[PDB]
Amino acid sequence: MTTMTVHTMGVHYKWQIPEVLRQQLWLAHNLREDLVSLQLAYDDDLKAIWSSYPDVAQAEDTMAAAEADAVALSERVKQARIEARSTELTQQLRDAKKRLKDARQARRDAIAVVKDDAAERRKARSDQLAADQKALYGQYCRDGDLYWASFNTVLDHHKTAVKRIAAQRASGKPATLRHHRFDGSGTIAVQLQRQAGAPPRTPMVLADEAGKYRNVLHIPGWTDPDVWEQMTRSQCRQSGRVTVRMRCGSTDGQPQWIDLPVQVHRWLPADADITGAELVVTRVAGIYRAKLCVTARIGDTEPVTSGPTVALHLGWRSTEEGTAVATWRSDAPLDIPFGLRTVMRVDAAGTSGIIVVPATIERRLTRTENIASSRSLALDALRDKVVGWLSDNDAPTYRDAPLEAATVKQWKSPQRFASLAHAWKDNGTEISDILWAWFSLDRKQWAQQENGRRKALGHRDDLYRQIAAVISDQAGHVLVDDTKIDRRRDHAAPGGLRASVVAAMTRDGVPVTIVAAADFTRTHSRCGHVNPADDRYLSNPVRCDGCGAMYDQDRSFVTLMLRAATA
Amino acid sequence: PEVLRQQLWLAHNLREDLVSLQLAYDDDLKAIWSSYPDVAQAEDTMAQQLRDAKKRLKDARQARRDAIAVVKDDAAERRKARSDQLAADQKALYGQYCRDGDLYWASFNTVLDHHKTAVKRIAAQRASGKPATLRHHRFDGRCGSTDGQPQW
RNA sequence: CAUAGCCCAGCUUGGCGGGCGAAGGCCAAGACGGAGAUGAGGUGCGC
Ligand SMILES: [Mg+2]
Ligand SMILES: [Zn+2]
């Protein structure tokens, strides 16, 4: 009964956005941005406190000197490359990089040794941070128009993000939070309060028009899924067009609701316990798509006992019909649906196979990239033409302010051009036609340049998700490794396959085992010999040192995974 | 006010009439062009394997435009006469909408400019090979006159 | 405005019919825990 589930419901595209919902997203944006600013302030205070220690000061000075030397040697290497227009200097740069890394390690050690001394300072700063957040809540809710559920959702997103960033900094990339501009896309939420000794907030309670949550969330017309699976797709998709009443927010101290047209495709089991509902507004190519997500609690499933062990392995080796994204082996023969037989290949015995992604995904993403490049060139052409016209003519006022060729010359994003164009719809100036002729065209392309991508990516996700299902249909146990060239890997992205497989195995209760993939690729299954060279594997197949015969590295990988599992 | 609603309804009505008149005027020009036997033959002709058809289609499209240019001078009077016909009909709508209607004359003048502005953009747009056109927009919802009584 | 893509009751795939910033949807197979485009830092809105 611990498991949580989330069901998605789409909103009608011929639905506008009320003024109250815009006000809520605006406030949510402002809250998130102030929170990011406070996060950076807190981080700066922490860095300053760390720096306060004289040993840390010395380490930081050494680090700064090493960084300056490294950047100077990088400049020298760049100058040598320019003069050559394309080894000892690189070695000096490598030495500088080593010195910088050593200084960084020394600084980390200096922080570590003195860490127990500034704990009180760090706790005091963190407490001040918490107090500032509480003041933010008092402003936004007790004195503001934000609904307290949305504030909680934004805070939870923010604290998830900060942990993500801290993990990334610990794990490499010195990334950080970046402010964002209010495009009009946001998140709102509503919580379901269930005090102690209260009846479950059953989905049937929600469909009541006089229920305990008629003022908070109401999705009329629920059906038992047992009946639902028998209704034809016609009455199914016709029945799901229902009108959700949702508490949205307050304006001048008055609650405001919205009435979303949603098309529900799956209902929740009668024993469920809803937790909350969050409405997500996304902008893609200037179209406001919305989506309502409902989260609840559901009883767990009994873990399986019978079912062959299935082992999976990942790569990104190429194949003439698409990227070969995985190789799977099974303890016993498996059954694969007929609609997927051209994506999840199978062998004669039915116990081995290759997962490939059809190349059409690659072709579509390449089309998107080429449309991106062409849009960039046409963007530059319009920039030049508008600059020329502005130089040779008068400047009608934009935002009640004269337009200067320098400012127009510095534009890089389409946004400024778009706003200017919508401003000069009917000025009668020729540039306006020149400023509209581009605009419309690009929004046809912009749609494609985004939508196709998402659509194409969606397709790939579908395949992976479908694959997950089939394995959980038969597998009593599933094993996974703990593991142009990068672009192809960014298109196929086996990481998605791993995530979907693990998620499906968790939902269905199948045991998941992470195999230690250490010393496997260099290891041949048949001859049992490791191979020290780390460059022979770039091609397939690879000759074996212990046997002198070429073998499939992936097949040996899955064979070894099964053998280690079968111990 | 209902006066505001009716004026917009008249405003929506006027644009449809102007759009209706334009296409007939647009069709009349097409009929004027189709009169020449060379134009009609090209239209019938207009009416890796992908590229061959596309090339021939545009060549047929270009030839129809080519036939238009050569006999442009010989049809100038006929095109003007229908052009004068369109203006007179457009003038007639002023009497029905403004002289004999409650629609404010400023509203008519504004929309007339917008349509005339629209056709200028459209006419050149179709010229190079980039087609688009006016279509009927469905009604969605001083303040002129009311049975000859001005209202504010 | 490029010459096939995008869109038209969640999503992806097929098929029927439509729209090119607007319209118009219908049918079928399957699957589904929401929470990741560095482009911005606007202090309300690529209409
Ligand atoms: Mg859909
Ligand atoms: Zn061997």
Numbering used by the authors:
A (entry chain A): 1 to 86, 91 to 487, 509 to 592
B (entry chain D): 18 to 64, 95 to 188, 251 to 261
From the paper:
A recent study demonstrated that the type V-M (formerly type V-U1, clade 2) Cas12m2 from Mycolicibacterium mucogenicum (hereafter referred to as Cas12m2 for simplicity) exhibits RNA-guided dsDNA interference activity. Cas12m2 associates with a single crRNA to recognize dsDNA targets containing a 5′-TTN-3′ PAM. Interestingly, Cas12m2 lacks target dsDNA-cleavage activity, probably due to the non-canonical His–Asp–Asp (HDD) catalytic residues in the RuvC domain, rather than the canonical, DNA-cleavable active site Asp–Glu–Asp (DED). Hence, instead of target cleavage, Cas12m2 interferes with invading MGEs through transcriptional silencing by strong DNA binding.
Most Cas12 enzymes auto-process their own pre-crRNA into mature crRNA without the involvement of a host ribonuclease. A recent study showed that, similar to Cas12a and Cas12i, Cas12m2 cleaves its pre-crRNA upstream of the crRNA scaffold, and two conserved residues (His269 and Arg270) in the WED domain may participate in crRNA maturation. His269 and Arg270 in the WED domain form base-specific interactions with the crRNA scaffold, suggesting that these residues are responsible for crRNA recognition, rather than crRNA processing. Indeed, a processing analysis of Cas12m2 revealed that alanine substitutions of His269 and Arg270 in the WED domain and Asp485 in the RuvC catalytic site had little or no effect on the pre-crRNA-processing pattern. These structural and biochemical analyses suggest that Cas12m2 may process its pre-crRNA in a unique manner. Intriguingly, when we analyzed the cryo-EM structure of Cas12m2 complexed with a 56-nucleotide crRNA, we observed an additional density close to the 5′ region of the crRNA. This density aligns well with part of the distinctive sickle-like architecture of the REC1 and REC2 domains in Cas12m2, suggesting that Cas12m2 may facilitate pre-crRNA processing through the formation of a transient asymmetric homodimer. However, because the present resolution is not sufficient to unambiguously elucidate the residues responsible for crRNA maturation, further studies are required to fully understand the pre-crRNA-processing mechanism of Cas12m2.
